[PDB]
Amino acid sequence: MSLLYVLLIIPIIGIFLISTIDSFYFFNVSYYKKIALITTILNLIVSLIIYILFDFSNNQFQFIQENLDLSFYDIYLGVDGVSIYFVLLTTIIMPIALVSNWNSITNNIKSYLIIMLLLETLLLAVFLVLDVLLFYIFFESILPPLFILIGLFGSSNKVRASFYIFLYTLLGSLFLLLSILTMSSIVGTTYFDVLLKSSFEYTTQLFLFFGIFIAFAVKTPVWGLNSWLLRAHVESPLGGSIVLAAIVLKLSLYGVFRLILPILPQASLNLTYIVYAIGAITVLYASFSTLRTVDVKELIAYSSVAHAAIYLMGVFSNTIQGLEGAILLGLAHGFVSSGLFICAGGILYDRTGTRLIYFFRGLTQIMPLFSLFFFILCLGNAGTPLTLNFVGEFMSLYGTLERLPIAGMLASTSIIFSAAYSIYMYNRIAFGGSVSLYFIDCFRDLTKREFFILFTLVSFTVILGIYPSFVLDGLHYNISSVVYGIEPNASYLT
């Protein structure tokens, strides 16, 4: 059995144990949550073992299993450098997301844990499948559990949010599916090691680009196709929000490295100016509206839109540093947005029952531990150096600038505006007077649980902000394979 199948199998086992342990012991729900948490820890331990064995400069897919039993739809699993870090992000985020909801899920706890465990398997399968149609199957599989997760555990507007995310993702994905089916018909399969050797003709590439781009712009999301996120990321339970912003936004980014860069190089280069205008517009518009957003969780949700615009522009840069910076930013966004959602949707929300900014002020006076982590997280959101967020923003922005200078210059303005909404939101909540007079009771500071999920997330962003080689070293060789172009005295050697 492959280690990659073990990765997909462990959460299914935990689902089985959670659903059957009532027959061997009214079992306390603590037991259920213990099983699910240990299930995620083991999945993380396996991914760490894979990474220790993983080789940084191999262009062969690693840890694959021979099938020799070909069918119409066979799940082939494999890993390289451009997918190994997304697998690690998924297995680190999932335990933290479980602990972040340890107390706030009060009814239907078995259903909540089974959905999150199933989400872990499906999201991991997205990064590991070696077939383009397998990518769509896992990308779309997470929708029904996400629909149910929002509708069973969401806030007051959960129905409208659940419908929005389902119908937006489905609609975009249906245009991606038509693009994938055209590829499958021309080439005869969507297996990576066969399709990547195909050379689609330019007009085919253009109409293939449209349809894959429509889906990825719905999922990025670009501004104007992002109301599903402003609803779903806010109405979701806290664990749903962490998974939705840390891993689910990353699907469209990893999807660009498999579905556009190797097989649509000519359409990608010829259309980069359309991608860059949309990415530039998204960076400014999302930034200005974040500045005027009064729901604290909606403000953290809108800043995800602005950050994802920069990794999208870095992924179309066709430069090494822009592509590596895009992956670096994707990962750094996962730690920072997880921490800011915990701070808002899990610490403020649990204490007050409200998400309106008008009711918060001067929290530093009574919650020094919260304000310390909240501030460090707000510096990460502003891309402050010593966070992995600066390294990703700088490399992404440099590649975007070098590819198309006017687009990079506008995208660079994010260095001013991400600071503006991060510092503005930090000042209004932690600072900005004495403790808010709307609080009748005093508030306790972070519990040990809250401290150690914030500390862990803050630890990852700072350690990788100082030594980003821990990810870049395993990125360099594989990411070389998606660059398109030639030097005159370097090419066609004899």
């Binding site: 107390n103 706030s104 899920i105 009060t106 009814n107 806030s155 507007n157 104007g224 980069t272 100016y273 359309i274 860059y276 205008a277 949309i278 530039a280 517009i281 518009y285 009064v294 729901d295 929300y349 649990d350 204490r351 007050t352 029952g353 409200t354 309106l356 008008y358 009711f359 070098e402 198309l404 200078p405 006017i406 687009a407 506008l410 007079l437 709307y438 609080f439 009748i440 009771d441 005093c442 508030f443």
Partner: protein
């Protein structure tokens, strides 16, 4: 009110009512000369301007290893 018991908050009805208006404002949008002009400016004009500028300057310049006796222009 939302699962776990939270602390007592002096929930100010005016502020709560303002928060409700913001959540429901989409239900009351209408096409007027003002709203159409603003929407057209933000969605069409400004993006198409950046798109046109990005189009016209794509490939215009390269800085890498440019010395004196050379040009930044490539095209």
């Amino acid at each position: 009110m939302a699962g776990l018991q939270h602390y007592k908050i002096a929930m100010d009805p005016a502020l709560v009512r303002l928060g409700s208006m913001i959540s429901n404002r989409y239900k009351y949008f209408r096409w007027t000369k003002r709203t159409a002009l603003v929407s057209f400016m933000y969605v069409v004009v400004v993006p198409s301007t950046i798109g046109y500028l990005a189009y016209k300057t794509d490939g215009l310049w390269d800085l890498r290893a440019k010395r004196r006796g050379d040009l930044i222009s490539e095209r």
